[PDB]
Amino acid sequence: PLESQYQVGPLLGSGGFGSVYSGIRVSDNLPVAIKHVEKDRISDWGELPNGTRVPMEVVLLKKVSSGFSGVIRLLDWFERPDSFVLILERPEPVQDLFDFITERGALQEELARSFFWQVLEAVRHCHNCGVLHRDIKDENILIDLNRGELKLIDFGSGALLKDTVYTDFDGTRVYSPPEWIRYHRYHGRSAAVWSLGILLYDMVCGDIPFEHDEEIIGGQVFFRQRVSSECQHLIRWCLALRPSDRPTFEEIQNHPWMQDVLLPQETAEIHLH
């Protein structure tokens, strides 16, 4: 049973993803997050090997939750008459990246490099597991403030990774690529790389580069803050208007700006403790 096994705490927030509560596992006081989403509000459904009808986010989470990684792992889930409840890892202490950037402003490039690098490894993990997240953004990244580790959250807009075109998208628009805006068509990896460019800009400028569709499809990148030539170059590359002109994950991680990354722990010691 759900609530004999978990002590529920405060509401952490709610929105399109459902409602998320702090909690602890009673059997060992493991910190968890407990996410409730109503069945009515569930768009995408998939199924587990044993043919149980589950939300797609459960399928995608099971696929990425094997092994250690930069993704918040699904520990358990329950079906209720009108909702599903998901039990997820909870770092403590934790702050999401949107909160973190809002609070502290544009990140020093050393910190942005460590963060961006960890996001790339987490996204590579997802893709290795056949999962495309489709809503990579500051709000979907938790910072473990003591370990200096980033963890991806919210696969509620995700899909199985494929090599053919995607013609659906219910992620965040301002992180969405120009080919989606104007054609309602994108391919998974190149659309991911676009969102990563948006994310890198956000980190080093303290805000996203584009608000309106017109700016997205123009894709002219203006820098409001002092940003290094190498960083500007990588950002402009990720935000190439033609998807085929964007770097692969390998090309990103081999970019001059991405060399000499800090380890998570030393990232925390220097920037977070």
From Swiss-Prot:
It comes from the Eukaryota. GO terms for biological process: apoptotic process; cellular detoxification; cellular response to type II interferon; negative regulation of apoptotic process; negative regulation of DNA-binding transcription factor activity; negative regulation of innate immune response; positive regulation of brown fat cell differentiation; positive regulation of cardiac muscle cell proliferation. Expressed primarily in cells of the hematopoietic and germline lineages. Isoform 1 and isoform 2 are both expressed in prostate cancer cell lines. InterPro entries: Kinase-like_dom_sf, PIM1/2/3, PIM_Ser/Thr_kinase, Prot_kinase_dom, Protein_kinase_ATP_BS, Ser/Thr_kinase_AS. The keyword Cytoplasm applies. PROSITE patterns: PROTEIN_KINASE_ATP (PS00107), PROTEIN_KINASE_DOM (PS50011), PROTEIN_KINASE_ST (PS00108). Autophosphorylated on both serine/threonine and tyrosine residues. Phosphorylated. Interaction with PPP2CA promotes dephosphorylation. Ubiquitinated, leading to proteasomal degradation. Its EC number is 2.7.11.1. Its cofactor is Mg(2+). The modification Phosphoserine is found at S66, S229. Residues 6-258 form the Protein kinase domain. The active site is at D135 (proton acceptor). Induction: By interferon-gamma (IFNG). Strongly induced in leukocytes by the JAK/STAT pathway in response to cytokines. Induced by different cellular stresses, heat shock and cytotoxic agents. GO terms for cellular component: cytoplasm; cytosol; nucleolus; nucleoplasm; nucleus; plasma membrane. Keywords: Apoptosis, ATP-binding, Cell cycle, Cell membrane, Cytoplasm, Host-virus interaction, Kinase, Magnesium, Membrane, Metal-binding, Nucleotide-binding, Nucleus, Phosphoprotein, Proto-oncogene, Serine/threonine-protein kinase, Transferase, Ubl conjugation. CDD domains: STKc_PIM1. It is an enzyme of class 2 (transferase). One of its GO terms (molecular function) is protein serine/threonine kinase activity. PANTHER family: SERINE/THREONINE-PROTEIN KINASE PIM, SERINE_THREONINE-PROTEIN KINASE PIM-1. Proto-oncogene with serine/threonine kinase activity involved in cell survival and cell proliferation and thus providing a selective advantage in tumorigenesis. Exerts its oncogenic activity through: the regulation of MYC transcriptional activity, the regulation of cell cycle progression and by phosphorylation and inhibition of proapoptotic proteins (BAD, MAP3K5, FOXO3). Phosphorylation of MYC leads to an increase of MYC protein stability and thereby an increase of transcriptional activity. Belongs to the protein kinase superfamily. CAMK Ser/Thr protein kinase family. PIM subfamily. Interacts with RP9. Interacts with HSP90AA1, this interaction stabilizes PIM1 protein levels. Interacts (ubiquitinated form) with HSP70 and promotes its proteasomal degradation. (Microbial infection) Interacts with Epstein-Barr virus EBNA6; this interaction upregulates and stabilizes PIM1 and induces cell proliferation by inhibiting the growth suppressive properties of p21. This is Serine/threonine-protein kinase pim-1. It comes from Homo sapiens (Human). The lineage of its organism: Eukaryota, Metazoa, Chordata, Craniata, Vertebrata.
